[PDB]
Predict the 3D structure of the following.
Amino acid sequence: RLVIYEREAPEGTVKDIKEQEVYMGEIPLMTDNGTFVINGTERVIVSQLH
Amino acid sequence: SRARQKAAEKVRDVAAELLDIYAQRAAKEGFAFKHDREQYQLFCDSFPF
Amino acid sequence: EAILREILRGGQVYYLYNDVENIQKAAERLAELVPEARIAIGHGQMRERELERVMNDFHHQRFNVLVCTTIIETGIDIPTANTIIIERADHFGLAQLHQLRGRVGRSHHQAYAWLLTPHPKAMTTDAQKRLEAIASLEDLGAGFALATHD
Amino acid sequence: SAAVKEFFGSSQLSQFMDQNNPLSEITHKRRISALGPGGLTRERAGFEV
Amino acid sequence: VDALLDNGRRGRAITGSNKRPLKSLADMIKGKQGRFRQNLLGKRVDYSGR
Amino acid sequence: KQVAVLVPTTLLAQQHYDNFRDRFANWPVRIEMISRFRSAKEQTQILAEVAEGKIDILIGTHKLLQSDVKFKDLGLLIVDEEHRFGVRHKERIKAMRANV
DNA sequence: ACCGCTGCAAGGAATAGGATACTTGCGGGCTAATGGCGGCGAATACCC
DNA sequence: GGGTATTCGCCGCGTACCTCTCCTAGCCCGCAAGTATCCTATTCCTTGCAGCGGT
RNA sequence: GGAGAGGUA
């Protein structure tokens, strides 16, 4: 959602505001067990201890 | 988005014509110019430097 | 501080941006950055009378900093202009880099030239080679070997 | 997409399953690794860790 | 010529693409992959099994 | 030998016209220019007169290389501010006279 | 009364605007490291 | 100046085999210049007729 | 051809 402040008015006012469903990224989904299927292979992220 | 792809080229060859003009230059002989000492010196005099 | 160094000398500044769609915004972006400079706009796509007005008013010192495209590359007079600020020297041909370095100068006054760079790892490797070449050679007689760098 | 695919594809942690059991799957899904980004080094860890 | 014989002996080392510096006539002699340690290191041999 | 001058803009032609005219201020030589800034009625006499040839020095932009300019005896090409002009515009004049 | 002079109709003429196709450059998008030890030069700072 | 301890960064970091996955690069179209034509339309400049002046 | 993960001895 984009806000545009109208220049003529003082600091912080609304000319108009638009909105649309932007798409960004293809996040992998975990399966029902634990596996992330990445390239037809079946990877697993291990928990890191730091 | 209307900036995608797909324009062709090579509507007219250059290489043959460049070779032609270069061969034509290297075939004929250039002009042997004539130089005048004092006439060129009077032109040098017009140079105020 | 580059703009201030030029204006309290008294001459004028070529500030070149080379994108006409946003040069209007870049004008005020520079203008509240230096509130005491006088900024007008000039580029090759105006109505071919306001351009001449801008350049002649520039020629009569009516304002200090000119935001411009590479229209100035046509090699105008007014040696009082003594500082080039190329805002994005990433995308500019090295021969006309030398040409724009020739634009300032023309005077006994010591001209200046700041070539703004983006962050060094962001840019093209070829741009880095270009900028190392232009940072190596700052003399007279160095135009030709700079073409051997081209 | 580049940032998430680089991590899910090529990291020190997103590793290939041993699938030659049910046991080897279910104990490779609980490995507590002390390596990878922000961690210590395979060759450069003392006798204390 | 100073880049030919040993590129990178200078602080400035000229490269090609992707900022990897070129191999010089030092680099086929320098280090752990030169012509000096390779004969001394393991060379795979014919007529063998495992 | 009908010197021909080529520059890649109108402005450089404009300074060159001053330079040529002011330096050749004492010799029987007629020097002119052509660009888009010249009117057609001036173009139609300048380029026609080039065939006649009392103009010996002619300055201009790409307007010279417009496949209509006919120098009666071309003897010298001078071209300024080189790194423009492609290749075709560079040798399109030499196509007229092989040993220019 | 009738050329003499003026104001307006027109017509062409010239010129801005906005197309097109040509050159230089060059990039942008796009397909095609802060969990270690040791030696040594640098760089000391340090007492003489 | 000048011997002398001292520290700090730069760079080396130690067998053989097997398995699996990740890797970047040139160019077409865009941008900015610049130049030419080509209609068009659109105002501008110039001319010629309509109509009143007058002494 | 390289980097990374594992596994054996």
